[PDB]
Amino acid sequence: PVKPNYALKFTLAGHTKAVSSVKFSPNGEWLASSSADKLIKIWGAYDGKFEKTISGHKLGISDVAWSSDSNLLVSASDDKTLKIWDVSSGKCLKTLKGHSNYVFCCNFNPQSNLIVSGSFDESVRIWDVKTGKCLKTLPAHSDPVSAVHFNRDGSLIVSSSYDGLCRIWDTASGQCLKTLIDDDNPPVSFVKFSPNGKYILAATLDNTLKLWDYSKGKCLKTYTGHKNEKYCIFANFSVTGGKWIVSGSEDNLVYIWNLQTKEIVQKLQGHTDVVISTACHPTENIIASAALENDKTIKLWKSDC
Ligand SMILES: COc1cc(C(=O)N[C@@H]2CCc3ccc(-c4cn5c(n4)CCC5)cc32)ccc1C
């Protein structure tokens, strides 16, 4: 389609500090949000209706992520722990202790039997969901880890760091398979596998997004026009309608690019602070965006294509 037409439908207020990370449940019914106010909040994905608040962390939360069956959440906190939550009961099932600094990023594998985490302690850890035990500690980087993500079959982990590196790890052995970006500058602020696991979306703190061919280790696409020099902003593949790249920006907008042509197709105006997190609904043309302390709200946008 030439361009989407995302429009603001709901604004979700409730957090009392900067929002950090929003994620749609895989079954499409929920939006989960995490914030520096130490709280997780669950919202109706289609009407933004507040459902519950999930509490337990002693310090702010930087990231949250859903299990495959939409029943569990994992959260990553400045209190140096991750917590596994049962969403329906709101109870903490396990506290994952081991990191010696802020836990900044987390994700389930598709099987939902493992959790990967990255921390300011410059390590990546792989946890067993059932027992809460740390299975592997990877000396992954030499600076804070900005993102960790499994691929579609769970056999690979991509990690990024302020040391300027992006590395790909073999889940079963923890050994490095490849260093995709091997520079000491700029800091690599976010990474994510494409849905099919063949490409890696990478953000760097020079206002640049890139699409990398994992197998070839080569950059295929470069996306520019937004502002990103200070913070680790989430970025997404939007696949429900047109094939877009979606990202927040430090000029308080949501940017949407055509994946193939690299042209900006839309910019969503409304937030009053850095749009730190964006997320794309699994089935509908819906985007969730969240902003830092001057805003503290979540916005839901819907497009016809
Ligand atoms: C990594 O080291 C730093 C990062 C920041 C930074 O980005 N702070 C921003 C403000 C608050 C906040 C909350 C969450 C996230 C976040 C989590 N996650 C991503 N962003 C992407 C994936 C998981 C970021 C930020 C600041 C300093 C260092 C040393």
From Swiss-Prot:
Sorted UniProt keywords: Acetylation, Chromatin regulator, Host-virus interaction, Isopeptide bond, Nucleus, Repeat, Transcription, Transcription regulation, Ubl conjugation, WD repeat
One GO MF term: histone binding
PANTHER family, sorted: WD REPEAT-CONTAINING PROTEIN 5 (PTHR22847:SF560), WD40 REPEAT PROTEIN (PTHR22847)
Result, substituting residue 292 to A: Abolishes histone H3 binding
Assigned GO CC terms: ATAC complex; histone acetyltransferase complex; histone methyltransferase complex; mitotic spindle; MLL1 complex; MLL1/2 complex; MLL3/4 complex; NSL complex
Result of changing residue 104 to L: Strongly reduced affinity for histone H3
Mapped WD repeat ranges: 14-53, 56-97, 99-139, 140-179, 183-224, 227-267, 270-304
Cross-link Glycyl lysine isopeptide (Lys-Gly) (interchain with G-Cter in SUMO2) mapped to chain: 17
PROSITE patterns, A to Z: WD_REPEATS_1, WD_REPEATS_2, WD_REPEATS_REGION
Keyword tRNA processing appears in the UniProt entry: no
Domain of life where this protein originates: Eukaryota
Recorded consequence of changing residue 260 to A: Reduced interaction with RBBP5 and reduced ability to stimulate KMT2A methyltransferase activity in association with RBBP5 and ASH2L
UniProt record, GO biological process: gluconeogenesis; negative regulation of transcription by RNA polymerase II; positive regulation of DNA-templated transcription; positive regulation of gluconeogenesis; regulation of cell cycle; regulation of cell division; regulation of DNA-templated transcription; regulation of embryonic development
Subcellular location: Nucleus
Major location category of this protein: nucleus
Protein name (database record): WD repeat-containing protein 5
Modified positions (N6-acetyllysine) in chain numbering: 83
Family the entry assigns: Belongs to the WD repeat WDR5/wds family.
Matches recorded under CDD domains: WD40
